[PDB]
């Protein structure tokens, strides 16, 4: 059993229980991603006297219902509104348990997703990205999906940055941030593969 | 020669004048089916006696589909606060109908 390319062809390692499906209790890893990594700023308004001006006023009780006495209300056009969005630094922790399995749950029915074992490229020489990526044609992988990327090299794993095409950021480990992004999940590094470690 | 009668309610003159009707539970959805029971009105050629022996012979009507609906929103309320609203889900078939 088990399909593969570049190297050999086999498989029996597993870990990760994964019954039928019933997955998706990882939505708090869809805002934490932008909380343990996010720049709050807003329009910035909470000050009740950002204006900083004089005091006293006209005849608060005369003429035509003054309703004066300085300017401390969100009425006069040209100021703020008092109280509101202050910088904020995003304070959430996200349970540290569900992570090395919640990911496995993202393989519930995503199992169909392409996955295997490999090492960059063997039918090539050094590095120059051309017919190396073009090798990804021995399976229709050059304009049919999205391609997941991981590897363990940082010397030849940076030559594919686009706006709508592929993504790339590697650290040689796992990341929910990139587990559906590229439809066929393909880690494989012979250095930091599916290891539960 | 003309037509009056009951069922559903009373809103007639039609003998071929074509007017929208009401509905029925089961037995709908399908061009024509025919339905009848007893009668009440008649007139006829100077012979509309009552609504008692308004049976005897039967006169087979038609029954169309269900005809869209005069959709609206509704609104009411006086000096306070604003709430409520509940659509008219009526069907209103057509029923060709034909004298007998």
């Amino acid at each position: 059993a088990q399909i593969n390319v570049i190297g050999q062809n086999g498989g029996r390692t597993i870990e990760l229980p994964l019954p039928e499906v019933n997955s998706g209790v990882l939505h708090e890893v869809v805002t934490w991603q932008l909380a343990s990594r996010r720049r709050g700023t807003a329009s910035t308004r909470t000050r009740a006297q950002v204006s900083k001006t004089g005091r006293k006023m006209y005849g608060q009780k005369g003429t035509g219902n003054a309703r004066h006495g300085d300017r401390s209300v969100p009425t006069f056009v040209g100021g703020g509104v008092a109280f509101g969005p202050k910088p904020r630094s995003y304070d959430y922790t996200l349970p540290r348990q569900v992570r090395q399995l919640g990911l496995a749950m993202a393989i519930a029915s995503r199992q169909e997703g392409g996955k295997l074992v490999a090492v960059d490229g063997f039918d090539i020489a050094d590095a120059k990205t051309k017919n190396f990526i073009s090798w990804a044609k021995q399976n229709g992988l050059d304009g049919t999906e999205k391609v997941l990327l991981v590897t363990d090299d940082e010397n030849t794993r940076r030559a594919a940055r686009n706006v709508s095409w592929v993504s790339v950021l590697p650290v040689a480990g796992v990341n929910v941030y990139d587990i559906l992004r590229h439809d066929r999940l393909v880690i494989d590094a012979a250095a930091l593969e599916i290891v539960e470690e | 020669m003309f037509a009056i009668i009951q069922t559903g309610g009373k809103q007639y003159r039609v003998s071929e004048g074509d007017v929208i009707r009401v509905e029925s539970l089961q037995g709908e959805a399908g061009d024509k089916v025919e339905l009848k029971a007893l009668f009440v009105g008649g007139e006829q050629t100077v012979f509309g006696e009552d609504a008692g022996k308004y049976t005897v012979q039967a006169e087979v009507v038609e029954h169309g589909r269900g005809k869209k609906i005069y959709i609206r929103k509704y609104k009411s309320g006086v000096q306070y606060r604003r709430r409520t609203g509940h659509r008219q889900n009526f069907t209103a078939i057509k029923i060709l109908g034909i004298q007998g």
Partner: protein
């Protein structure tokens, strides 16, 4: 954040301005005598197609009262003549029909008139 609804609140006023009927002056594009006159068109308008029976009720109680008095007639103290046939039941609408054939009470007079003894 942000919204700027300095254009969306147009169709709102109009979605109700549907009733820009012949009111007064120019109460069809007013912006006063519209969303107010609408609140005026917001009364028994709700029940202005049912309660109306009371209005058209003021019809058959002049005709059904005593039309062809050349018989006997009474209507009121005669309704006990109506529901005195085999299967009377029905009543109005058939009054609206009574506006057609005058022979709606020929042999339908003394066929309830003395239908007592």
């Amino acid at each position: 954040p942000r919204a700027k609804t300095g254009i969306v609140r147009r169709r709102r006023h109009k979605k109700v301005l549907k009733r820009a009927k012949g009111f007064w002056g120019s109460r069809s594009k007013q912006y006063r005598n519209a969303f107010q006159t609408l609140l005026n068109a917001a009364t028994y308008e709700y029940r202005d197609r049912r309660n109306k029976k009371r209005d058209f009720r003021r019809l058959w109680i002049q005709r059904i009262n005593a039309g062809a008095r050349l018989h006997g007639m009474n209507y009121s103290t005669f309704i006990n003549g109506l529901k005195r046939a085999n299967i009377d039941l029905n009543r109005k609408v058939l009054a609206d029909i009574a506006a057609r054939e005058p022979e709606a009470f020929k042999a339908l007079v003394d066929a309830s008139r003395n239908a007592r003894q």
